[PDB]
Write a protein that binds this ligand. Structure first.
Ligand SMILES: Nc1ncnc2c1ncn2[C@@H]1O[C@H](COP(=O)(O)OP(=O)(O)OP(O)(O)=S)[C@@H](O)[C@H]1O
Ligand SMILES: Nc1ncnc2c1ncn2[C@@H]1O[C@H](COP(=O)(O)OP(=O)(O)OP(O)(O)=S)[C@@H](O)[C@H]1O
Ligand SMILES: [Mg+2]
Ligand SMILES: [Mg+2]
Lengths: 251, 219, 219, 251
């Protein structure tokens, strides 16, 4: 009934509300804005002594990288808040509520992703207003939203399941960071070394951790039919597992 | 809220063993026993924080159950008032300002309700936690040592307030608690739990009853 | 262990105000007051967990101080026994097996001492925590509601045990606690704290004394 | 007096004792061993169809990388254990003890670093026993110890200070990982872009975070006189700050 739905949404509202009140959020936004403005101002308009013309695509990709990381950390905090304060015990009292808890968090993750995508959009629009160059297609920004939604929801639900499996929070933040910064590190470090190097590299296109992390610094994207399906399928199964698990795990 | 043949063990340690429970038209049921007997365990089964109890827990899920188990659960960087509003909106039906105020002033937590929880004393946290549970305007209230950290006056006012509320709301209250003297203030029965099962059903000191039953464990 | 002119505030909230304290050749001093008065604060100043108290805390650092403040502090994934050994070796002088055993069996925690702490009940954790403090074989023992979660028998045996120990070891004990009835079992004086200062020094019910002093806050 | 020193050491012994009992330690060791054996077996002895002759230096560097990360996490756990369990409150009761606490942890960090260096040594000795190639100089392994001691002590004390400053543990594990995997990521991503690119890159030689992280994957090292001094000086000041801070921070 709508009463159930209402209670679920009320929890969502509080998590988002918190994001918009903590000064930390505001700080993080200012940091991103500063870094982007810095790149634009310092060299995009000056390195080759151009007549102040820049590549928004370079800015775009950098902004995405930063916001996806900050976003993922916001997602992790959203996920771990109840384990941290121990308040989870007050929610998981019956199946209807336990399931609603997962639903609420899933919704919050989606809304966080939307927020970050909106920030990304705004930062880049300001850059476009500020200098010269051909503006990016609206549809490019839209596809960027899709990337954010998928990236963050995939990692969010994955980490959520782990959080519930272990009931630890320190290692969730650790994994969020670790996974993001390991793919781009390890690829060029050793992928080329084994006789299976090419095999391994090709394999990454079918592994969401690898391809979603790699695309975090791309100016654009185009998922292959398989790659698209695999990522979305992974999201669906994690969601399902979270439900099946929460329904059985003692708190 | 009925328990039929509940059995629960941790490995080889049987805590509950074919234990039955109900409210025989009673409203306030006290739960008495020694530490290590399983009072919290029983309450968790009723709350539904345990799903491995090998038995039947009969709950009309249409109803709300409010509860407080072990140490208080609060969001530390938020105000007391914030927590009450949140839980009323989240676990409860909605935030009822008048209801909330009656509890705050009855408990006398008013002077610090707008301060952050992390700045609260243990006692203050418990007064708030009880209120948090009450905010669901539940029918079943399950409290694990609700006055454990309260001072003499706090305990009396809180317990008195709850008794008033069980008529305002059609409630059934289960209180697991030391300080038999507090149970004696607000009760209409008490059950004595020992070795995984109920031993006495005492309808209405409780201290004398308790010792008669449990003193021989150690003595 | 003497306190001279201790003053402590949190922002505008003055908790202690020119408060003095000593042991006038007494051994067991109870501390009584309402929740929000500052009993823990006083103890933290004495323990030395606070360094911003604007006053003089006179401690011969040659001596050991054992203590328990708020909820028990234990390593959750280790056994009870492990914690006792660790603290005896770490904060204490060394691990005294005979001493340890007397406490374990006197408290009656023996049946679960080898189990992991995370599997302990709140009551069990407190019995252990008291023992952990005692393991330092301290001279000054400071306990914040030491029997807060104990059952009727646990409380009596633990408190009795400590009183025996204050002669075995030349100790001075400060106990902040509700359950005036427990203070009355083991005490030779009690002090009543209100509005940041001591109001009565009662040398030796304490419950009647308490209400006479504090009831007017709320009533 | 020796009584003080004894109590400090008893705490150290317990932290190390814990490391040697948890199955997680054993798992981590096996993982490293497996990865090294894997590289040796799969391609070092076969990629170019050599007569089973390998470069121990490639193995050496990889092993170092893995052990330094695992090591740093062990260090972080050692640091945060008391905040996590709340047991820190039982230690910080007086200045002599508060200071001793810092001393104990400093010693534990050093001993952890030694342990990891010993593991590194053993893994590589096994590899040398196993296949052909010119064995690495004993003195190279020794210098590798020095690297471990410095790397881990620098990060350890830095993170320790943060841990005490914030009294949070989730963010200590996060920083440990983040810092390690960010330097090698960011360098080639944007260092070359600004007109100050060369200036920035050169600057990294004087910034311990950058140069210590970068050398984690080197087969060897040679610190410049400045670089050597800067790192060691940084360790000393962190140690000092930890003492000054613990002596004043309410618990
Ligand atoms: N997570 C757990 N793992 C193993 N044993 C447990 C666990 N939780 C509780 N127990 C054991 O179950 C028994 C009863 O536990 P509780 O329900 O917490 O006790 P209780 O009746 O509430 O007692 P208190 O805490 O002193 S009021 C004890 O023997 C505990 O050691
Ligand atoms: N970290 C803190 N920040 C702000 N205020 C605090 C903090 N800790 C305690 N207080 C306040 O200091 C006063 C006394 O605190 P405590 O020493 O914890 O009380 P108490 O006498 O031990 O009471 P209990 O917990 O009910 S026995 C209260 O008004 C608290 O709100
Ligand atoms: Mg209990
Ligand atoms: Mg207190």
């Amino acid at each position: 009934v709508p009463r159930g739905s209402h209670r679920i949404l009320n929890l969502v509202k509080y998590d988002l509300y918190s994001i918009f009140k903590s000064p930390l959020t505001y700080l993080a936004i200012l940091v991103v804005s500063s870094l982007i403005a810095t790149q634009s101002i310092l060299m995009a308009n000056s390195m080759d002594n151009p007549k102040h013309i820049i590549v928004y695509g370079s800015v775009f990709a950098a902004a995405k990288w930063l916001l996806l990381i900050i976003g993922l950390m916001f997602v992790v905090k959203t996920i771990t808040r109840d384990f941290s304060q121990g308040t989870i015990q007050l929610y998981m009292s019956k199946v209807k509520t336990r399931v609603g808890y997962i639903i609420s968090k899933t919704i919050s993750i989606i809304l966080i992703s939307i927020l970050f995508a909106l920030i990304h959009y705004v930062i880049l629009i300001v850059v476009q207003a500020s200098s010269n160059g051909k503006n990016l297609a609206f549809s490019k920004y839209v596809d960027n939203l899709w990337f954010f939604l998928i990236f963050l929801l995939f990692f969010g639900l994955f980490l959520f399941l782990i959080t519930l499996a272990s009931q630890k929070t320190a290692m969730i933040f650790s994994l969020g960071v670790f996974l993001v910064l390991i793919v781009p590190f390890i690829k060029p470090f050793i992928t080329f070394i084994p006789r299976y190097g090419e095999k391994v590299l090709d394999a990454f296109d079918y592994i969401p951790f690898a391809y979603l992390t790699d695309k975090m610094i791309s100016s654009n994207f185009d998922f292959s039919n398989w790659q698209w399906v695999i990522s979305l399928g992974s999201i669906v199964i994690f969601f399902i597992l979270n439900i099946l698990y929460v329904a059985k795990k003692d708190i | 809220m009925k328990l039929e043949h509940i059995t629960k063990k941790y490995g080889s340690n049987v805590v509950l063993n074919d234990i039955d429970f109900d409210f025989g038209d009673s409203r306030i049921v006290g739960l008495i026993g020694k530490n290590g007997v399983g009072k919290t365990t029983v309450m968790k089964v009723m709350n539904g924080n345990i799903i491995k109890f090998d038995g039947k827990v009969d709950i009309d899920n249409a109803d709300n159950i409010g509860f407080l188990i072990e140490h208080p659960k609060l969001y530390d960087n938020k105000s007391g008032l914030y927590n009450l509003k949140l839980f009323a909106q989240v676990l409860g039906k909605g935030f009822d300002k008048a209801y909330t105020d009656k509890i705050i002033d009855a408990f006398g937590m008013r002077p610090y309700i707008k301060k952050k929880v992390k700045k609260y004393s243990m006692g203050m946290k418990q007064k708030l936690a009880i209120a948090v549970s009450l905010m669901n305007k539940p029918k079943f209230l399950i409290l694990d040592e609700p006055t454990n950290g309260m001072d003499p006056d706090g305990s009396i006012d809180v317990l008195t307030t709850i008794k008033s509320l069980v008529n305002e709301l059609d409630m059934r209250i289960l209180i697991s608690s030391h300080k038999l003297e507090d149970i004696e203030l607000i009760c209409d029965r008490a059950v004595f739990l020992r070795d995984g099962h109920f031993v006495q059903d005492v309808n209405m000191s409780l201290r004398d009853t308790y010792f008669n039953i449990n003193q021989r464990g150690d003595k």
